[PDB]
Design a binder for these strands. Structure first.
Lengths: 176, 176
DNA sequence: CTTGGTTAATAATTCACCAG
DNA sequence: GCTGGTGAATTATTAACCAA
């Protein structure tokens, strides 16, 4: 334990981080905010996934990132840290507790919408197209190759997904 | 106890409420949604109160009531009763008289004139605000067709200084 | 006092989903 | 090609604090 406590703080990664997150702090709070939200949104990552790991208040965080309501250093610092980490965390997850709910990214949405002008009930196969069409796209966004889209992981597209997405779509419209 | 149970089901008032709501369910679903959205809108009742008292899924109600997504009968029936009761409920406490506590909600009225009095004086001093407490408060009473007297019936959604207070401030604070 | 941070609550939306 | 009903999670937004 304290021996891992330390055995953590010391790697070249650890340091690399302690210090990137350090300039983030010296720099403009907001310009940082963008970046991240940037980030988050490139990879589609639940805001929740961040409160959870950082323990910052979720409304506090939503605003300082969507609105720049100022966050006191200590906190920021946490949040930056999160992000720098997850940036490797996210990194290996390719090149190399709660289980996140999937989300349509706008990219896949784009297709889906386009593809859907009078597509009530797609053929369990036409579906399949688009599954494989989406992720191909979703990788474009995150700056890798279609080759393996398995890193998308939590937000990996599937049948049943577009499935419902039709389906729900065909209810959506269905009223007003 | 079953004697209460019975003595309850069996009132002049009560009984007729069954009738009213029973007719309501013969009507166009969305016409009642309309009705009620409105009614609540008027008295400013939390969507959440309904959700407890009735015990319907909170999203389902936001739909069936905004989107007008279809809700099976029973649930409806459970709504109309609600709405129904409430109505006497609201008007006892109101018209004639002298596990968790709702929460305040500013109403367009109160709000309108708030945003006027605003681009007019960034920081109202107690007297100042105080005026407004009686402005809204009256206006709130118009809305629900009653007397500026005993705007005391507004109850929760009753306006106050400190309440007006923070309504500046998160009006002030919010221009960053 | 008042800002300045920070918050618990509400509710529109989003995704899933099972029983006819 | 299940398909209407519903429902848990999510996150922008609201209305209040408490610390200095």
């Amino acid at each position: 334990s304290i021996l891992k406590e330390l055995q953590a703080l010391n790697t070249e990664e650890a340091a690399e981080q302690r210090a990137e997150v350090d300039r983030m702090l010296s720099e403009d709070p907001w310009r940082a905010a963008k970046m991240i939200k940037g980030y988050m949104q490139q990879h589609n990552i639940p805001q929740r996934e961040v409160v959870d790991v950082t323990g910052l208040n979720q409304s506090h965080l939503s605003q300082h990132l969507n609105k720049g309501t100022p966050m006191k250093t200590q906190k920021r610092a946490a949040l930056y840290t999160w992000y720098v980490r997850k940036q490797r965390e996210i990194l290996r997850q390719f090149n190399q507790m709660r289980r996140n709910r999937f989300k349509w990214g706008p990219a896949s949405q784009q297709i889906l919408y386009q593809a859907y002008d009078r597509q009530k009930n797609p053929s369990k196969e036409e579906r399949e197209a688009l599954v494989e069409e989406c992720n191909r796209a979703e990788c474009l966004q995150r700056g890798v190759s279609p080759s393996k889209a398995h890193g998308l992981g939590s937000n990996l597209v599937t049948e049943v997904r577009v499935y419902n997405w039709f389906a729900n779509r065909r209810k959506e419209e269905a009223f007003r």
